[PDB]
Design a binder for this molecule. Structure first.
Ligand SMILES: O[C@@H]1CNCCOC1
Ligand SMILES: O[C@@H]1CNCCOC1
Length: 340
């Protein structure tokens, strides 16, 4: 690798480790914010558009219910998410601005990206052209080069987690499955369509699962549907482990070749996991037109700018029932979340 890249990644790792070893804590409180609108909701948390009452800035506030985190055995994952997010710094990662906890909940206050999820745009447009898919893919390649150099596995690559910003660039959100891993890890996590075979088969797996997921993402962006699509998870898993993938005839030969090497069921043969690491991907013919430095510097004109009216516009997000942010009079699960 060019010494320029080595020295960049060495500095990136130094800066990450300093924050990793001494995490920030308790940098805002709930009553500093007005709630605006629920942007997403799940089994143990929600994401809320909020506005800071003094500065007027908008943020996406992820709120996790401590009792539900415990019940669903997600404690370590939530601690991973916050400790990692407060320590990273890269152009295509959403920034954590504040974090805090109270008697009931954990809070991560992130930048708000009003352009919405790639998922919505992809489903509205049908499929992306190869140049359009390649622009997004290149950002993920660089983001994974960064994260993996810090010994971080992301483990949740899917279109819903890629927000499109005001310049048309990606910002990766949701670090709920991200983990610092030297070697292997074992947790079953990730959306069915994106799971690598070694996860399905309950093996000790490594960063190669992220490169598999990139193959799935590129296929889905360029085709409009994922490669192992089926109606129930069991049938999806059978397809994933089979070693077979079919490509639309509109795919270029270069795209097919790259995808065969990312969607390699033998993890010891999978691009991103060989002796040349990420460079087997960056040097592949499908990326021949990609100016990696210009992408990193955000100097490439993006495929499209999402339509939105301003930093408080929620039009590109969905409508959800609005529920209270209740804070118990009594502290819940204090011991489990001491480090948050
Ligand atoms: O945030 C984690 C990963 N993303 C999907 C929802 O599950 C929890
Ligand atoms: O600690 C083990 C692995 N980490 C996540 C799931 O909980 C059990």
């Amino acid at each position: 690798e060019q010494e320029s890249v080595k020295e960049f990644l060495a500095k990136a790792k130094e800066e990450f480790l300093k924050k990793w070893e001494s995490p920030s804590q308790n940098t805002a409180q709930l009553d500093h914010f007005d709630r605006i609108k629920t942007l997403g909701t799940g089994s143990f948390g929600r994401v809320m558009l909020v506005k800071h009452k003094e500065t007027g800035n908008h943020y996406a506030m992820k709120i996790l219910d401590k009792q539900k985190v415990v019940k669903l055995k997600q404690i370590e994952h939530t601690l991973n998410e916050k400790r990692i997010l407060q320590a990273v710094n890269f152009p295509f990662l959403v920034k954590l601005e504040f974090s805090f906890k109270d008697n009931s909940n954990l809070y991560m206050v992130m930048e708000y990206v009003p352009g919405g999820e790639m998922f919505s745009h992809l489903r509205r447009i049908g499929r992306f052209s190869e140049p359009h898919a390649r622009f997004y893919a290149a950002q993920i390649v660089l983001t994974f080069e960064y994260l993996h150099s810090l010994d971080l596995i992301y483990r949740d690559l899917k279109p819903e987690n890629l927000l499109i910003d005001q310049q048309g660039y990606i910002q990766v959100t949701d670090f709920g499955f991200a983990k610092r891993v030297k070697g292997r890890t074992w947790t079953l996590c990730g959306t069915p369509e994106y799971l690598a075979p070694e996860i399905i088969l309950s093996k000790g797996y490594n960063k190669a699962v992220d490169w598999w997921a990139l193959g799935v993402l590129i296929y889905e962006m360029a085709a409009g549907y994922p490669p192992f699509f089926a109606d129930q998870p069991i049938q999806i898993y059978e397809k994933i482990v089979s070693g077979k993938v079919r490509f639309p005839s509109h795919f270029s030969s270069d795209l097919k070749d790259l995808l065969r090497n990312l969607l390699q069921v033998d993890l010891t043969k999978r691009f991103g996991n060989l002796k040349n690491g990420v460079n087997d991907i960056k040097n592949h013919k499908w990326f021949a037109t990609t100016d990696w430095i210009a992408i990193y510097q955000r100097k490439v004109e993006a495929p499209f700018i999402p339509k939105f009216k301003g930093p408080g516009d929620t039009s590109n997000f969905d409508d959800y029932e609005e529920e209270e942010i209740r804070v118990s009079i009594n502290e819940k699960c204090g011991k489990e979340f001491t480090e948050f």
